[PDB]
């Protein structure tokens, strides 16, 4: 009883540290007996001490005395009424800024997370105020998992934490029982299925409960199944050839199809025929592609950098005229003793000046001031001013260039200088394909449309003049707006040429270098169609149309060019295919519009007629193979979303469609109100009420082909002016959507969190109900939708997703994440294929809002799994985690009710009101919409393992049902959503025999997946030679390739990284490309495009930043170890001879008996190079110095990794738009970036000149500048200032790299031309990092592989297999094959 | 061989002539061996 508190009592005093601040509690608490006091104070004693812990130890002073916000703001003697109350934990008040510190220790990671989020809302809140104050806040929380403080040891806090909790289950006996509040004393600060919880299951899980046994009879016998199929069919082909329709299935012939094709659009596009008219009209179609085919034939030039250089520090319109008297005077002295484009004086920004306003800014900014001695009083301070910009940051020398132009001014010669040069259709020749010339002339106005982006604020003739530079000759550009939006460009040659069109720069990265590339796409397709038929003159025609077409889609990218030729697969697999749903031609048809748009069309049926006209079937293989790389050829253009709004919209349409036909129920409760229980009520009664003649597409699921399905598995026989007015008129959502979204108030920071679980009632764990939130993914066709919830729920959902996907695993047909079954999938399907039996591959359609949890539910609480406590239990926390999600709370996004609103308050102050429209206009007569929660949900993605359950059981049924009516049981995969059916011999001949039959059959198979929740897609076939599953087609035999899939991949993600992992991921997709069929010399130019890419942000191209530029198909057995070596192993061509048989005695010496400690000693990273002198003495030959000091090359990331502690160490740590990152990647690498080695930051350029200029060093180029041939062995007035400690040796980072390859991938690597917990515990193995590699944690040769790869730290080698997958089986050419090393 | 069609016309059930791994018809045959030499499809001579 009170030996617990006389504990205590002698603990505290005792025990403890004896502050002034815990004195004053100490005392009370001490001096106190009853329980529930004793424990209070406690709790309090206990949270005060982590306060001031926490406080002190980052250095904020404690608010011991509970002081306000505004308290401590006036304590300063600062009045500032009104604010937020709030006490922080700590603060710290300085002249100008303010600290708040907020801490807190939680123990689960779901509570601790949401206090995170809630106390950084709450400290961000007060932002604006405390600026608009004149202060600032410096944010800052301490979030600690663990009770450890200063003044109190670990056993002293154990042992106290202990004493209270046992004194409080002692209170817990007596009257001093807390409901609930007790649990989150006890059970709260002291996964897989906490069964903690109480149970307030009642009158409602008896509702949802029983609906789930109403109807079905889960337990009919083994023939009284067949019995049931048997009356289920036969009272349907009884009904088909009256009742209900002809199957959507229907054969083909494959004019039929063209001929539809050809008709589409009989309104405008209405056959226009022959060749020549179709190119005439598409080298006419937009304004662009009027020039890219029309035939047409330094000291300025750096004083720019240096008057652009000193621009960004400061901005104003009072200066940058100043700013260009400074260039409009360079342009007097060049031309006077002797680009311009007639009124340009290009200034600093890219700007471009008009030569009147200036020269007449001046003479009033002048005469406000002996008009001739009035000058140089601005023309020479400002030049020293500019200069006072000097060393200050490496001024570099210009600065004394300029001081012989700028004082070469007068006023008898600034009276004329801009009176001097006083002087303010090309059309489309069609021949020009087959002819760099016309893409290599968009790969430059596109490079000069994408720079562009990279303008600034800069606040006629005012206009943001680039440059197009070309061979020789450049024309301009004019627009007026920058950023990333839209503007209205123009072109400028020798004569005016407005050009005028309407672009953004964002969409137009793919052409940027690459001329050489695509013009190489489309002539390696062209040589896979030299069919005969077509010898005759239609394969210049095929090659003219293709060509403009690529033109096109460059040209005018745009969402539609992409779904339409996304959509040109379909039909080409329909036109090779046997059956194929009659809505096709609906499946197909866009709107078009913009002449581009139609043209395009036109080239396509063009293009279908040509190759799949007469004579057919006679190469179908590569006609097929040409027509489906056509179809992929629509990923040139960029997937970047047109529009913001306009994509948030339309994905909640397609959320909210369904539920307008069903129910909805919008705002729910968090407690469910009467109405929600009958609104649910109706929704699970006409659910499951669906009769065996359904309308074909709405959600429901039979209880009568239901009850077979379940009954077949529990019994054994399945298994094995105006914008302001109109915007404040449409600020009314503000008066309509609120639709919101004594305990120990001061300890809830403390020991006690406020919010866990605790009892649960069927609808949600009695801290919230599952809400949830939706926006849009990003994809080539259409935006996915996309689910994210908050930690809690996002933790909840595992359960189940967890649960079903280990059920699932014992049933051996998904193929999802059951990686081995795709292998075996893509045996069995290869196998099929070859013979020729049917495959229908089907993909089902609404397999999102079509799916219900209730529908899981229902098929959960009917199967008969086995034994109790451990299967009769847990499936009852499934089916009430599934409960939960039936009542989740989805919710409208902000944007998308602001536009709704909008729209309702402009038509209802002033149709063609789309359905989810009129919805708002009836609740917001009445209340706005906030939250909808409805029954068909399936959040998309969020149950994809569950889903993926019940479908592979419903396909495992329904080829039953077929094999029970007809006669052949046909196997099946799935993925939860794509599927197969492999169709056996006996279906197969019968399609020749009888086609009447299989149509009954593919009639039969969409209509049970009717009767149970799967609907058949009008995008499926059932072809006797091609298959699709998840996107692997197949021809007979062999594979399609699908080059400009992969293409299209690695031309785009060139990401804002340090450019030594920019060019990895790179060579990572170059190898995914090389895994099938893209030849390499197109890989080449790939790689050849990214180094231009890099060599245009002026970054010096040391020899390990992208891989040979010169490969053999030799990607095959090399790591990107063996690339780099192959590389040093040509750039330095004679000196790696020795290296390379110093690493053969090396290797031959290490393996038996020799080294492997020693090896270490001599790899001497303790001190500077002779370390390879030293070990080529140890046990070989001469050796010179030549190799060792010679070779050597300048390394920006030596001493610290340049701004924007080994590189395993970090990728093991890392185990616990697209163009604006290049518009900035080529910023910051320019810029002061490299660092020193005492963290000063210095240029490439005044760096990258010193070292081959200012000193006896060699540095001439390969392609790729090895500099300082010498560096004769570093002997020299070292560290001049960084340019010679910077640089380390070639010939022995080749040495590491080229002993690393040979334990790695087999001792060839030398002669002449597995997982994380492993590295881990290899890193283990030498101690010194692990006190930094092991508290983030919550074989043969293998140490000196990971030791080589912590010293290269640039380089992969081990922490490659365990960050990037590799493949497995490869496809290559045999043209490849025959050209090795 | 393997199947019994065309390897080239992806039709006709039967009536066809060997290649060296693959069927070929009387056609077929015809309208590529008026081209060129080789077997497109299998990479190598087409036979007479
Ligand atoms: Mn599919
Ligand atoms: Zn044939
Ligand atoms: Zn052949």
């Known amino acids: 009883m009170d030996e617990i508190i006389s504990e205590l009592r002698e603990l505290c005093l005792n025990y403890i540290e004896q502050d002034e601040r815990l004195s004053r509690q100490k005392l009370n608490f001490l001096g106190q007996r009853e329980p529930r006091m004793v424990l209070i104070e406690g709790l309090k004693l206990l949270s005060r001490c982590i306060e001031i812990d926490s406080a002190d130890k980052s250095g904020c002073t404690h608010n011991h005395d509970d002081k306000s916000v505004e308290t401590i703001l006036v304590e300063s003697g600062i009045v500032c009424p009104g604010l937020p109350l709030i006490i922080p934990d700590g603060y710290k008040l300085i002249d100008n800024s303010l600290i708040l510190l907020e801490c807190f220790v939680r123990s689960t990671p779901a509570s601790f997370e949401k206090k995170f989020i809630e106390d950084t809302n709450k400290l961000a809140c007060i932002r604006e105020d405390l600026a608009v104050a004149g202060v600032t806040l410096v944010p800052i929380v301490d979030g600690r998992c663990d009770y450890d403080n200063s003044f109190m040891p670990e056993w002293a806090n154990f042992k106290f934490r202990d004493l209270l909790f046992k004194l409080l289950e002692y209170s817990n006996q007596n009257e001093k029982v807390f409901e609930e509040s007790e649990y989150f004393r006890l059970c709260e600060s002291l996964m897989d299925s906490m069964k903690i919880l109480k149970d307030a299951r009642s009158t409602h899980n008896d509702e949802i409960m029983r609906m789930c046994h109403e109807g079905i009879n889960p337990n009919m016998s083994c023939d009284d199944v067949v019995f049931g199929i048997n009356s289920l069919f036969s009272r349907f082909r009884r009904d088909l050839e009256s009742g209900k329709l002809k199957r959507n299935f229907q054969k083909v012939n494959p004019e039929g199809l063209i001929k539809e094709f050809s008709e589409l659009y009989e309104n405008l596009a209405d056959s226009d025929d022959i060749l020549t008219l179709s190119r005439e009209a598409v080298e006419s179609c937009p304004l662009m592609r009027f020039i890219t085919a029309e035939t047409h034939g330094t000291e300025y030039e750096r004083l720019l950098s240096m008057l652009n250089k000193v621009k960004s520090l400061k901005l104003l319109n009072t200066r940058r005229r100043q700013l260009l008297n400074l260039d409009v005077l360079c342009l007097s002295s060049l031309i006077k003793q002797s680009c311009y484009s007639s009124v340009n004086d290009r200034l600093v920004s890219f700007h471009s000046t008009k030569e009147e306003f200036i020269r007449l800014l001046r003479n009033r900014k002048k005469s406000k001031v002996r008009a001739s001695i009035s000058e140089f009083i601005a023309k020479i301070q400002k030049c020293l001013l500019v200069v006072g910009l000097s060393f200050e940051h490496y001024g570099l020398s210009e600065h004394l260039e300029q001081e012989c132009h700028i004082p070469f001014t007068e006023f008898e010669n600034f009276m004329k200088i801009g009176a001097h040069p006083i002087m303010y259709y090309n059309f489309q020749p069609s021949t020009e394909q087959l002819k760099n010339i016309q893409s290599l002339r968009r790969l430059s106005s596109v490079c000069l449309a994408l720079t562009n982006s990279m303008k600034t604020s800069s606040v006629c003739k005012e206009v943001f003049c680039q440059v197009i530079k070309l061979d020789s000759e450049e024309y301009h550009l004019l627009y007026q707006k920058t950023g990333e939006s839209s503007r209205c460009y123009s072109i400028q040659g020798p004569d005016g040429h407005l050009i005028s069109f309407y672009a953004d720069p964002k969409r137009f990265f793919l052409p940027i270098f690459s001329d050489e590339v695509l013009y190489n796409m489309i002539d390696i397709m062209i040589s896979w169609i030299r069919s005969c038929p077509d010898l005759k003159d239609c394969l210049t025609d095929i090659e003219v149309a293709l060509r403009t077409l690529l033109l096109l889609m460059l040209t005018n990218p745009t969402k539609r060019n992409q779904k339409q030729v996304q959509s040109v697969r379909y039909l080409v697999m329909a036109i090779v295919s046997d059956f194929s749903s009659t809505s096709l031609m609906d499946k197909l048809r866009e709107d078009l519009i913009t002449p581009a748009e139609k043209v395009v069309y036109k080239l396509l049926r063009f293009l279908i007629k040509t190759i799949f006209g007469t004579g057919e079937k006679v190469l179908l293989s590569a006609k097929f193979k040409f027509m489906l790389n056509v179809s992929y050829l629509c990923h040139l253009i960029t997937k970047e979303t047109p529009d913001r709004l306009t994509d948030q919209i339309k994905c909640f349409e397609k959320f909210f469609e369904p539920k307008s036909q069903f129910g909805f129920f919008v705002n729910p409760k968090e407690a469910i109100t009467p109405e929600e229980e009958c609104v649910f009520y109706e929704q699970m009664k006409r659910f499951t009420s669906k009769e065996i003649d359904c309308q074909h597409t709405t959600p429901g699921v039979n209880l009568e082909a239901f009850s077979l399905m379940v009954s077949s598995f529990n019994n054994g026989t399945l298994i094995f002016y105006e914008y302001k007015v109109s915007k404040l008129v449409s600020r009314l959502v503000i008066g309509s959507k609120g639709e919101e979204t004594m305990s120990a108030a001061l300890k809830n920071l403390c020991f006690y969190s406020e919010e866990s679980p605790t009892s649960y009632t069927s609808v949600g764990p009695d801290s919230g109900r599952l809400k949830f939130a939706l926006s849009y993914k990003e994809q080539v066709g259409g935006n996915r939708e996309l689910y994210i919830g908050d930690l809690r729920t996002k933790m909840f959902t595992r359960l189940i997703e967890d649960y079903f996907e280990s059920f699932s695993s014992f049933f051996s047909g998904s193929c999802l994440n059951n990686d081995k079954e795709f292998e075996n999938a893509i045996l069995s399907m290869t196998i099929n294929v070859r013979e020729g039996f049917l495959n229908y591959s089907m993909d089902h359609s609404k397999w999102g809002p079509m799916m219900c949890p209730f529908l899981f539910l229902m098929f959960l609480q009917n199967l008969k799994l086995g034994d109790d406590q451990y299967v009769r239990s847990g499936k009852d926390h499934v089916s009430t985690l599934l409960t939960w999600h039936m009542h989740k709370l989805v919710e409208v996004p902000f944007p998308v009710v602001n536009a709704m609103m909008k729209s309702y308050v402009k038509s209802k102050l002033k149709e063609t009101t789309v359905t989810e429209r009129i919805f708002r206009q009836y609740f917001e007569m009445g209340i706005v919409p906030s939250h909808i929660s409805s029954l068909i949900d399936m959040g998309q993605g969020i149950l994809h393992n569950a889903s993926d359950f019940y479908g592979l059981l419903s396909e495992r049924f329904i080829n039953y049902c077929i094999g029970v009516i007809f006669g052949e049981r046909p196997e099946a995969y799935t993925s939860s959503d794509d599927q197969i059916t492999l169709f056996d011999r006996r279906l197969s001949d019968l399609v020749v025999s009888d086609p009447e039959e299989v149509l009954v059959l593919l009639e039969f198979q969409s209509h049970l997946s009717g009767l149970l929740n799967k609907f058949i897609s009008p995008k499926s076939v059932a072809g006797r030679f091609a298959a699709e599953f998840k996107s692997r087609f197949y021809v007979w035999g062999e594979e399609v390739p699908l080059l400009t899939k992969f293409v299209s991949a690695a031309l785009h993600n060139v990401k804002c990284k340090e450019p030594h992992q920019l060019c990895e991921t790179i060579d990572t997709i170059a190898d995914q490309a090389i895994a099938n069929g893209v030849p390499v010399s197109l890989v080449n130019s790939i790689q050849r495009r990214t180094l231009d890419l890099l060599k245009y942000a002026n970054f010096p191209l040391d020899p390990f930043l992208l891989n040979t530029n010169t490969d053999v198909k030799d990607w095959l057995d090399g790591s990107r170890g063996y690339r780099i070596q192959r590389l040093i192993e040509e750039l330095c061509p004679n000196e790696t001879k020795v290296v390379r048989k110093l690493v053969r005695k090396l290797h031959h010496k290490l393996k038996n008996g020799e080294f492997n400690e020693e090896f270490f000693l001599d790899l001497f990273n303790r001190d500077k190079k002779e370390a390879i002198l030293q070990l080529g003495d140890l046990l070989g030959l001469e050796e010179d110095l030549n190799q060792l000091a010679d070779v050597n090359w300048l390394n920006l990331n030596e001493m610290f990794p340049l701004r924007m502690i080994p590189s395993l160490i970090k990728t093991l740590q890392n185990k616990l738009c697209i163009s604006s990152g290049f518009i900035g990647l080529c910023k910051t690498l320019g810029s002061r970036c490299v660092r020193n080695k005492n963290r000063e930051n210095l240029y490439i350029k005044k760096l990258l000149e010193d070292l081959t200029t200012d000193d006896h060093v060699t540095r001439v180029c390969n392609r790729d500048g090895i500099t300082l041939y010498i560096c004769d062995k570093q002997s020299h007035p070292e560290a001049h200032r960084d340019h010679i400690c910077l640089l380390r040796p070639l010939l022995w980072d080749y040495i590491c790299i080229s002993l690393s390859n040979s334990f790695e991938l087999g001792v060839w690597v030398l002669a002449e031309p597995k997982v994380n917990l492993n590295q881990v515990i290899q890193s283990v193995r030498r101690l010194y990092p692990k006190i930094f590699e092991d508290q983030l944690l919550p074989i043969k040769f293998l140490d000196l592989c990971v030791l080589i790869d912590i010293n290269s730290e640039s380089l992969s080698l081990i922490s490659h297999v365990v960050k990037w997958k590799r493949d497995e089986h490869y496809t290559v050419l045999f043209s490849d094959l025959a050209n090795s090393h | ?48």
């Open chain 2, 1 to 48: 061989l393997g199947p019994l069609s065309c390897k080239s016309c992806w039709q006709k059930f039967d009536s066809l002539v060997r290649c060296h791994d693959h069927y070929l018809c009387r056609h077929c045959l015809n309208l590529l061996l008026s081209v060129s030499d080789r077997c497109p499809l299998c990479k190598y001579p087409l036979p007479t």
